[PDB]
Write a protein that binds this ligand. Structure first.
Ligand SMILES: Cc1cncc(-c2ccc(N[C@@H]3CCNC[C@H]3OCC3CCS(=O)(=O)CC3)c3[nH]c(=O)c(C)cc23)c1
Ligand SMILES: Cc1cncc(-c2ccc(N[C@@H]3CCNC[C@H]3OCC3CCS(=O)(=O)CC3)c3[nH]c(=O)c(C)cc23)c1
Lengths: 130, 130
């Protein structure tokens, strides 16, 4: 219905705003775009589902997220990919892992403060009906 | 169940084989990998969901296709993207559009000859039950 279309449109607006706020944070610059294959040639083979914030934006615009829960799976993916690909004790790996966890924590904190639980429940019940 | 897991495993095997046969065809080399942004800088802005045969393989391996119908949507996407991005009368555009339609026709012809309709129906009914 038109009312359900309005619901998903509001969701997309909410998700774009959260994603933009993450993307403009200097700490998360490394997650803003797909990895440069020249800098990490084995990334494509090691990480089976790459994810980044520009890709998240594209997925929002393609109507791929019907719930905030689905969105948070991709945010979690950005984080888990970073922990998987950069597991070492060296400062470089530890920096990106810290930033990865900070990205996840920040996304979850924004959603906790700004997502209405009844709005999310509505989205879930529309998703389940289809 | 284990029987349903076997069904989707057979599907993935079937889809990998079809995709490999398309990928080794010289005509379809242009569709084998994501576009080089240096050669087509405006592609990312013009084409909202890029698709290619290496990405199709990754999606198979990530269990993204539960039916051959879902697979054929991405094959159709490779084709429609080519018709959208290369619409002109020039020989270059007409060549890639011909190859795009040939890729689609070839995928559909292989599936018509080699996909058992009862196998596809089973996949669809498992997909619908979830
Ligand atoms: C400008 C740029 C463009 N494309 C990719 C990189 C990069 C480069 C190296 C990585 N991993 C290295 C694996 C081996 N040990 C050191 C690690 O680099 C640490 C470095 C710290 C600073 S940063 O800005 O967080 C980038 C990663 C990466 N590891 C990653 O997980 C990602 C997402 C990127 C990355 C950088
Ligand atoms: C080696 C390589 C790597 N990455 C991208 C290209 C490329 C380059 C140009 C395109 N479109 C042009 C737009 C303007 N008019 C001429 C068109 O090129 C025609 C050319 C014919 C030969 S081919 O091998 O089919 C590549 C396309 C493309 N148009 C496309 O749709 C795709 C998928 C690719 C492409 C080539």
């Amino acid at each position: 219905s038109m009312q359900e279309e309005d619901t998903f449109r509001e969701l997309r607006i909410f998700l774009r705003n959260v994603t933009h706020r993450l993307a403009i944070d200097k700490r998360f610059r490394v997650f803003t775009k797909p990895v440069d294959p020249d800098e990490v040639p084995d990334y494509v083979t090691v990480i089976k589902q790459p994810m980044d914030l520009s890709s998240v934006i594209s997925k929002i615009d393609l109507h791929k997220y019907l719930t905030v829960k689905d969105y948070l799976r991709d945010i979690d993916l950005i984080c888990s990919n970073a922990l998987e690909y950069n597991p070492d004790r060296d400062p470089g790996d530890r920096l990106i892992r810290h930033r990865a966890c900070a990205l996840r924590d920040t996304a979850y904190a924004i959603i906790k403060e700004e997502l209405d639980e009844d709005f999310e429940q509505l989205c879930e019940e529309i998703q389940e009906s289809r």
